[PDB]
Design a protein around this ligand. Structure first.
Ligand SMILES: CCCCCCCCCCCC
Lengths: 88, 19, 70, 381
């Protein structure tokens, strides 16, 4: 966070393996989230970078989330789609 | 008890407003 | 079905322990280097005006001090 | 509309005291160190207002006093501006461009990763804004999303003040929870008014509070409440802290009740010292639209036994079940431990409840003292 605006990259990986062979069974849930806050290519460079002194750069955020489940997984832990965080 | 409470409240309010 | 469960597991490892394990460690090592730099500058502060050594703690004390306010 | 017992319990809170004025530290001491004491601050407020009035009238001494106060105020303001500029420069020096980040709220233990969703609540520190923002946590939230829903804003001010003297204390609190389906909006406002000060008369204060609640999808009705309370000290003695309050509650659809169920309540509060007993009493009567409920709370203390605390409660429904409750509290220090006991007696149900809390920090002697449940525990098959 520079001048109140965030730039950079963030990767988040979650793996859930059910080593259940006792009703859970075999299940494999993999979630990968990649978020990139990049300076806007169209917007010219702000004064906060060059002069070093007081401006927050304009940002473009690209977020990709991929979730895959394999095996038999109960409805309690089932992957879904929706919710305020996932999709407004 | 209702009449006593109402009378006491009215008297207290009047006394506080007088000063 | 279930028969494909183990094989994919290898792929997960193939992604983590071949890629995740070095990468983050690199950054960790990078941080360590920066830390050393700071102490070097402190040495200069002790070098000027004839000041004695700042008796920096050992790494064993340092990683414990990570749990502290430091 | 809630039952009259709820209103009678709300009204019989106890001895109350409205909030007073706030004072600056630089102006009050004219650039010198000061301490805290009430009565000497409201005196400064009213005194400076009166001296301003007299200086406008033409008294030279009032003019001199006001000029000195203005000089001190200007010096304090310039000092604070310089301090703010220096603090901003230092903050820039420490972190060149990186704004300070805030610690995320810790929810607690769960089977989900404890470090997950921490990035969402880590935001850059906000500017010196007047409002205060707090998150609201619901009971049950989404399984795979954060359980924080809604927000609440809190604001305080003392407007209509000149040079930091005088004004009207004003507090506001708004809780808003808005989603694609529901809407919860709870607002509350408090306003304080001061009529006189001990040097210029008695202590006369009036507090006006107004609270409204809206729950759109479930209730589809709004509720309004307005209460006015008057407090004056030494009404029947040197100090009695007399207070009288009047509340009006309405459940109309919008604005005026428009035939909506109304309720009117009145409360009285006073404390008195008779012999060895310092008794505090608060009694209220509420009437809804036609049952009437009565409530009374009393706190009684005995100076020869300061360790015992005695509270009495009496609640009467519409004529006429009278509920009487007595609560006694006591404390003592055991061997390397502290034990606190509470006894609650109710005559309506003829019940007595005794609770004893224990804290030991030296050793586990109390643990070895109590071992009955281990033997009492049986497999029973
Ligand atoms: C401006 C005159 C001073 C007294 C004002 C009293 C207003 C409150 C009385 C009614 C509420 C109990």
């Amino acid at each position: 966070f520079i001048n109140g605006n965030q730039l950079g990259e963030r990767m988040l990986f979650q793996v859930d393996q059910g080593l259940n062979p006792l009703s859970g069974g075999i299940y494999n849930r993999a979630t990968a989230s990649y978020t990139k806050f990049l300076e806007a290519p169209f917007l010219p460079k702000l004064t906060t970078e060059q002069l070093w002194k007081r401006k927050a750069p304009n940002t473009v955020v690209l977020h990709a989330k991929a979730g895959n489940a394999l095996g038999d997984v109960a409805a309690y832990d089932y992957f879904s789609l929706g919710g305020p965080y996932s999709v407004r | 008890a209702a009449a006593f409470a109402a009378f006491a409240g009215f008297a207290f309010a009047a006394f506080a407003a007088a000063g | 079905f279930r028969w494909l469960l183990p094989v994919a597991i290898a792929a997960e490892v193939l992604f983590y322990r071949r890629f995740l394990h070095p990468r983050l460690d690199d950054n960790q090592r990078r941080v360590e280097r920066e830390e050393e730099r700071v102490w070097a500058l402190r040495g200069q502060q002790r070098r000027a005006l004839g000041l004695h050594r700042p008796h920096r703690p050992d790494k064993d004390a340092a990683w414990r001090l990570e749990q502290m306010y430091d | 509309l809630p039952p009259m017992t709820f209103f009678v319990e709300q009204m019989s809170e106890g001895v109350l005291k409205p909030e007073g004025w706030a004072t600056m530290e630089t102006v009050a001491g004219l650039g010198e160190e000061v301490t805290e004491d009430e009565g000497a601050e409201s005196f400064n407020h009213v005194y400076y207002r009166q001296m301003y009035e007299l200086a406008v009238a033409g008294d030279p001494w009032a003019q001199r006093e006001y000029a000195a106060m203005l000089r001190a105020y200007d010096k304090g303001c310039e000092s604070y501006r310089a301090s703010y500029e220096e603090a901003d420069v230092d903050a820039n020096v420490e972190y060149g461009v990186e704004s300070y980040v805030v610690d995320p709220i810790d929810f607690g233990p769960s089977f989900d990763p404890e470090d997950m969703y921490s990035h969402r609540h880590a935001y850059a520190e906000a500017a010196d804004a007047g409002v205060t923002v707090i998150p609201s946590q619901d009971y049950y939230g989404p399984e795979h999303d954060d359980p924080l829903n809604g927000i609440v804003f809190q604001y305080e001010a003392q407007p209509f003040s000149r040079h930091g003297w005088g004004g009207v204390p004003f507090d506001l609190t708004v809780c808003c929870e808005k989603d694609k389906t529901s809407l919860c909006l709870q607002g509350e406002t408090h306003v304080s008014l001061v009529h006189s000060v001990p040097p210029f008369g008695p202590r006369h204060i009036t507090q006006v509070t107004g609270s409204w609640e809206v729950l759109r999808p479930n209730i589809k009705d709004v509720m309004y409440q307005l209460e006015v309370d008057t407090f004056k000290d030494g009404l029947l003695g040197k100090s009695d802290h007399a207070g009288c309050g009047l509340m009006l509650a309405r459940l109309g659809e919008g604005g005026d009740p428009r035939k909506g169920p109304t309720a009117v309540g009145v409360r009285l509060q006073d404390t008195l010292r008779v012999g060895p007993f310092k008794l505090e009493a608060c009694a209220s009567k509420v009437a809804v639209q036609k049952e009437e409920g009565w409530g009374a709370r009393a706190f009684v203390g005995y100076d020869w036994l300061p360790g015992l605390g005695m509270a009495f409660d009496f609640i009467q429904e519409r004529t006429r079940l009278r509920g009487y409750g007595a609560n006694f509290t006591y404390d003592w220090e055991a061997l390397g431990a502290a034990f606190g006991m509470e006894v609650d007696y109710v005559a309506a149900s003829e019940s007595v409840f005794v609770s004893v809390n224990a804290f030991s920090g030296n050793d586990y002697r109390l643990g070895w003292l109590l071992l009955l449940p281990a033997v009492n525990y049986f497999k029973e098959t």
